[PDB]
Amino acid sequence: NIVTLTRFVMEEGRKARGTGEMTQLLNSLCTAVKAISTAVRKAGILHLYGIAGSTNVTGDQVKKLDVLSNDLVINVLKSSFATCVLVSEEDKNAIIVEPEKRGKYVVCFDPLDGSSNIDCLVSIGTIFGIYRKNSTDEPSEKDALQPGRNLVAAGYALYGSATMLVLAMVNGVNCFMLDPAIGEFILVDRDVKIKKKGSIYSINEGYAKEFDPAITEYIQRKKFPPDNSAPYGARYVGSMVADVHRTLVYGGIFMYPANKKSPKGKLRLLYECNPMAYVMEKAGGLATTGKEAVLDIVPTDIHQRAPIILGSPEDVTELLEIYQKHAAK
Amino acid sequence: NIVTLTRFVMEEGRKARGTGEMTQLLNSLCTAVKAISTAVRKAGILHLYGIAGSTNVTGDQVKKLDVLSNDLVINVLKSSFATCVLVSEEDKNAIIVEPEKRGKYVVCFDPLDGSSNIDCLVSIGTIFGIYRKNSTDEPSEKDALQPGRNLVAAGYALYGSATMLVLAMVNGVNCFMLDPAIGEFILVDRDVKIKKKGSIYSINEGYAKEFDPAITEYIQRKKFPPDNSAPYGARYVGSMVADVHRTLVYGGIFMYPANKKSPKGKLRLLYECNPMAYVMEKAGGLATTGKEAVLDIVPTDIHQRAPIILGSPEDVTELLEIYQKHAAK
Amino acid sequence: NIVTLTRFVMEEGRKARGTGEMTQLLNSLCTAVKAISTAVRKAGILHLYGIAGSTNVTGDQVKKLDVLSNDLVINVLKSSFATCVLVSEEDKNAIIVEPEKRGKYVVCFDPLDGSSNIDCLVSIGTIFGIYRKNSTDEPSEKDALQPGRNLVAAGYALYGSATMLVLAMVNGVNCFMLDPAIGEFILVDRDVKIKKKGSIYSINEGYAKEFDPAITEYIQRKKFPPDNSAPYGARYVGSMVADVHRTLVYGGIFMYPANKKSPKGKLRLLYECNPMAYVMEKAGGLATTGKEAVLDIVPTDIHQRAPIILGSPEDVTELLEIYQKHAAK
Amino acid sequence: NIVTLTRFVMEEGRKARGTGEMTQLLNSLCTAVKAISTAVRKAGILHLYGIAGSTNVTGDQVKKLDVLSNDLVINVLKSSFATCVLVSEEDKNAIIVEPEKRGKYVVCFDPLDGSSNIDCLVSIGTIFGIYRKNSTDEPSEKDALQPGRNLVAAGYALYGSATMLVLAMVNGVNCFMLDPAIGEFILVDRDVKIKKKGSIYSINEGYAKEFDPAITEYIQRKKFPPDNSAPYGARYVGSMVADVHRTLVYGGIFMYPANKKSPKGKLRLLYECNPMAYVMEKAGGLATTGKEAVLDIVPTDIHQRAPIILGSPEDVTELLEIYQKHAAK
Numbered sequence A, B, C, D: 001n002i003v004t005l006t007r008f009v010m011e012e013g014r015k016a017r018g019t020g021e022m023t024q025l026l027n028s029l030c031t032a033v034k035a036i037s038t039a040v041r042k043a044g045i046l047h048l049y050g051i052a053g054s055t056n057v058t059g060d061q062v063k064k065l066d067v068l069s070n071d072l073v074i075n076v077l078k079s080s081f082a083t084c085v086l087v088s089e090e091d092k093n094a095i096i097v098e099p100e101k102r103g104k105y106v107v108c109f110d111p112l113d114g115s116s117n118i119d120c121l122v123s124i125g126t127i128f129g130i131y132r133k134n135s136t137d138e139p140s141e142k143d144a145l146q147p148g149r150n151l152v153a154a155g156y157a158l159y160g161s162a163t164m165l166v167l168a169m170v171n172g173v174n175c176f177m178l179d180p181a182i183g184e185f186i187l188v189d190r191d192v193k194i195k196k197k198g199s200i201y202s203i204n205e206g207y208a209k210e211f212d213p214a215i216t217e218y219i220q221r222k223k224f225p226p227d228n229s230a231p232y233g234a235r236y237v238g239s240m241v242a243d244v245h246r247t248l249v250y251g252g253i254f255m256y257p258a259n260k261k262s263p264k265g266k267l268r269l270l271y272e273c274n275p276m277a278y279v280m281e282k283a284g285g286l287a288t289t290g291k292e293a294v295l296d297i298v299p300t301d302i303h304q305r306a307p308i309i310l311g312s313p314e315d316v317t318e319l320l321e322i323y324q325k326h327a328a329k
């Protein structure tokens, strides 16, 4: 037997005895992902066929994939009639859905993460976080400022050697791989659980001069294990989706802490950190800022940044112990 | 207008007054690359059918798509009636082509490079180097033990966010992107030249305790520039084709020097180092082991390894100077 | 805005306040169609790659597309958990679904009609008819012997110049075209209605010597209009799905009456005639055996044959008047 | 092994000691055919964006995919640098290639044949005929007014249940099927030969009142065989490429003789009749107007029409004998 994302989502909706609004929401996001996947695998042939350049300027008629993807996602969520407020990396303010197409869900997303490095063909992806409209007030961007802990569903689509949709909900994480021949996501990893301890650390060491004492010490341990065990391997694709997915599948740790130029980290809280933290915790892993759990942070701005350390529970705990080791001696 | 790889190869063969053998050899590689690309984009799906039940156990790594990809390349190369000797990373001995299908080219290739990175969907690729049999003797392993400097054609196929075929010949380097809809590689970057100086360094710093003094001093200088400039950003996909292609496009430096387990480096000279070195040099970059030019090494073993440092000339030269500074002490 | 089959079916299910069982059934049939479409567009490359021949013999390991498609459809309907009894052109007896995967729906289908002429690449398709389990008895093939008039849903997938899924339900006929790039059926014709009168007649005239008086007279009228109007055009693809779809879109009439070798017509009642009659009537057209409406026939055998005349209401009525013109003078 | 069209063409060019111009011309056609095929399989979708609002109105028929397909062929042919004169069914005058892109071949083609059959998704195709400029003069329309007998290459692409490219040259006829997954045409039928006698006749019998005595007597004989054999089955897709390809594969006869509106037939001699006639003859079949061989007609108008009867030799000869029997009275 083979399970398609479409069937899995439908059956989960039925068991949840939902009204079918969330199901439509997920179906819509899935369709969006397939369209973005198709475009990504041919990005260079589009950004050139219809004029091009070397700079980074988007217009009206001819716009980059980044804008395209964002337009596609928004259009599909508004058409699902399941949302009321949308938050995107590409929009300064939150998008309030038209009353006539208004649903009860709030969606935070990164339409095409790592796109800034699409030129070198490195993996890129789409990150999403879904919230249930809490208050009865009129839809507003405050509705998208709920802590990750209130997430009903979260995940990402990774456009790497293959395209994958990782979906996490209250009962677990499942990975579905896209078969481009039939346009169907096939379940290939059920109820994923990250291993307790890994052997790979992921961080941009070019910021070494700006790292805090704890991180500086942790990296040294990975290279020079005091107990003389085997040093960890290092991997840093430069694309959050790619690095996190590898962490999820092979275990280990991924880090993007605060430093000099980034006193509060670089990764965005609403559509980058929370979703990834949610997937991690649902997989038995940890996601912390180094002092507090990411999902517990109280968001104050939709574009707020946040430090993030995540991955295997033992590796993250080890780093947590180092942070605790530092303070006011 | 829009130039397809098929048209570009044919016209180059015509200008060179070739008998068509090499043109046919290249046509065959392109076809094989498309087939591998299609398989890669759904590798996880092709699987799932009762494998065994492994987790880590340091041992077997031979994946199914690895062998199939190899068999495809071999079958396609023999069928081209343009080769006499084949060297694959998957075959312990050189493959000698039967008399009837024998041509005059020697092909060294890595069918599907990027081992520890398919299960996590990291970018992977196919690497190739082509030599003209420089002998009147009966075809044998010796015909493949030529220095990279003798290559008449070299390149790689990168299965990343998109699929790219990069071809380098005497005339220079060109990048063609695969449009999966029509099965045609479209020329998207002509006569590629590498940036004289980059701002990214690429290496697995996990082997830090095993690095020689030159590499060690170099890494520190990238993190703590003595001239107080902005430090280099770090990137290491863990897939040679992915890391090298980013070096080609964004510039900078890629490094895989000798370490404990790899006293002479890890990367294979014939089908990993040489092709990448040839591409870099045709693009105006440099490829050194730290002491000598990769392309000028005369191999004695088809599976011989070699340390490699490649990328922007100013970046590679700066490291070269460190090496000779220490050697001058 | 653009409507996908997936969304249309979901929204229709919700408005119908269904439990989601029929929705899953249609989603499953849709997925099946995409897989069959993919195989059909490459049929000749499969029936050859894995051995071949000229005869018509299927085995165990290597079976023809016909069997493949049938295996795919059955497997997908049993996995939808929405059916209890299945009737296929390829199976002598009805298939009683396993209790554990038993649903309330009865499905009659022609997995790959016109496949016998796949060799010439003529259009082929998949026909389906869906019934609601009436009695409370144990599932049996008598459950599939309901008159077409009891159809809840019916339609077909046409694999022609493009792939199309035509779905008919109580409120109308809608056509969705498959976009092979994203694996999605896009709504392209809403609530289809056949024109009142056409200008094309479709029948195999090679059976002229075996036609009854009425049909012989009707064909003469189309070629030699008594009122000297323009003679109708003739079209006969030889594939029911193709001929009917054209009739639906361009109007006119399609005929496969009884003759010599076929005293009761050739086309099957359960998975060929009824579904097409249902689509026709739902589109404002007519489907008659020449004396009685197809949907009103009381099926007595799952493989029963039946004469069928269908298409524009005025063209079919005209022929009905001719039949009435003949009897016992 | 598996032979791709790309490899088959190249090797044939090599055996012929061609300079590569014709090989490049054929490579270009193949690429264009793949692009048209992809568009065709989703033509209905490419549309939908505010056309106008027509129903029947005997007038405009020029579809959008018709022009785009034509522009593609032209652009692709000029870019091949192998042609000097082009004749398209869509251009009122011959297209003369600019000096810089001028080669020595003349190409007559029908970009997307199958007018009254795309909206109903009937099979459609692309037809082509290639001539060597047999003149030292300045390229002009005259270079295309050669008799079919002078063709150096002819064929068609059929977008049916699958996409097939049929190529005929002095050596014979070969059929290649397009694998849309890898964008390669696979040789599936080598040195095709037509059945000496078929059991299918193909004609639009709607013009019955306009048929000459020979065609009339022939049709009756197919329905009421004087030797009491089984009558021929009838087939008429309404798309020349579809009907002709079935004639090639199953054998039999295809007919489109002169009628009222078409006193000299409907089908175009240069880019419809001749290519199909050349294919038939290279396959051992016959192609006649009823009085003379299609390939021996010297055209005087590039858009000239001609009656055509083609297919199995015994079937075509039997009709030929009827024609001469009447002419002998």
Ligand SMILES: Nc1ncnc2c1ncn2[C@@H]1O[C@H](COP(=O)(O)O)[C@@H](O)[C@H]1O
Pocket (backbone or CB within 6 Å): A009, A010, A012, A013, A014, A016, A017, A018, A019, A020, A021, A022, A023, A026, A104, A132, A152, A169
């Ligand atoms: N497809 C689904 N998968 C998982 N949980 C679902 C699904 N549909 C609905 N639910 C759950 O049921 C709640 C109500 O669904 P709805 O009526 O569609 O808004 C959602 O907020 C989820 O907690």
Ligand SMILES: Nc1ncnc2c1ncn2[C@@H]1O[C@H](COP(=O)(O)O)[C@@H](O)[C@H]1O
Pocket (backbone or CB within 6 Å): B009, B010, B012, B013, B014, B016, B017, B018, B019, B020, B021, B022, B023, B026, B132, B152, B169
């Ligand atoms: N398609 C081509 N592109 C570039 N150089 C070519 C091509 N075909 C032939 N050559 C050159 O011509 C030499 C002889 O080609 P061949 O006769 O095909 O073995 C090759 O070794 C190349 O140096």
Ligand SMILES: Nc1ncnc2c1ncn2[C@@H]1O[C@H](COP(=O)(O)O)[C@@H](O)[C@H]1O
Pocket (backbone or CB within 6 Å): C009, C010, C012, C013, C014, C016, C017, C018, C019, C020, C021, C022, C023, C026, C104, C132, C152, C169
């Ligand atoms: N997706 C749907 N589209 C149209 N009608 C539907 C749909 N789902 C359910 N229905 C109608 O509601 C009935 C009960 O649905 P169910 O509970 O799924 O068996 C069906 O027999 C149909 O008449």
Ligand SMILES: Nc1ncnc2c1ncn2[C@@H]1O[C@H](COP(=O)(O)O)[C@@H](O)[C@H]1O
Pocket (backbone or CB within 6 Å): D009, D010, D012, D013, D014, D016, D017, D018, D019, D020, D021, D022, D023, D026, D132, D152, D169
């Ligand atoms: N690919 C090919 N297949 C078949 N015949 C070819 C091919 N290439 C060249 N020829 C033959 O050689 C002649 C001269 O080719 P060219 O020098 O390319 O114009 C053509 O007109 C054909 O008769």
Ligand SMILES: O=P(O)(O)OC[C@H]1O[C@](O)(CO)[C@@H](O)[C@@H]1O
Pocket (backbone or CB within 6 Å): A113, A114, A115, A204, A238, A239, A240, A241, A266, A267, B233
């Ligand atoms: O170059 P840096 O500072 O390491 O940033 C890399 C990070 O930036 C992002 O692109 C954020 O958009 C992430 O995908 C990635 O992890």
Ligand SMILES: O=P(O)(O)OC[C@H]1O[C@](O)(CO)[C@@H](O)[C@@H]1O
Pocket (backbone or CB within 6 Å): A233, B113, B114, B115, B116, B204, B238, B239, B240, B241, B266, B267
């Ligand atoms: O894990 P390590 O030691 O950094 O090695 C990674 C390298 O190995 C390979 O996977 C093959 O040797 C390369 O693609 C990659 O550059």
Ligand SMILES: O=P(O)(O)OC[C@H]1O[C@](O)(CO)[C@@H](O)[C@@H]1O
Pocket (backbone or CB within 6 Å): C113, C114, C115, C204, C238, C239, C240, C241, C266, C267, D233
């Ligand atoms: O060759 P005949 O007798 O006209 O039969 C054609 C009919 O047979 C079928 O193939 C039945 O399987 C129909 O698709 C088609 O309409």
Ligand SMILES: O=P(O)(O)OC[C@H]1O[C@](O)(CO)[C@@H](O)[C@@H]1O
Pocket (backbone or CB within 6 Å): C233, D113, D114, D115, D116, D204, D238, D239, D240, D241, D266, D267
């Ligand atoms: O409708 P008619 O007169 O039979 O003509 C159909 C013929 O016309 C064409 O559509 C083009 O003239 C051919 O493809 C087909 O054979």
Ligand SMILES: [Mg+2]
Pocket (backbone or CB within 6 Å): A089, A110, A112, A113, A114, A272
């Ligand atoms: Mg981002």
Ligand SMILES: [Mg+2]
Pocket (backbone or CB within 6 Å): B089, B110, B112, B113, B114, B272
């Ligand atoms: Mg390798």
Ligand SMILES: [Mg+2]
Pocket (backbone or CB within 6 Å): C089, C110, C112, C113, C114, C272
């Ligand atoms: Mg049938």
Ligand SMILES: [Mg+2]
Pocket (backbone or CB within 6 Å): D089, D110, D112, D113, D114, D272
């Ligand atoms: Mg035409």
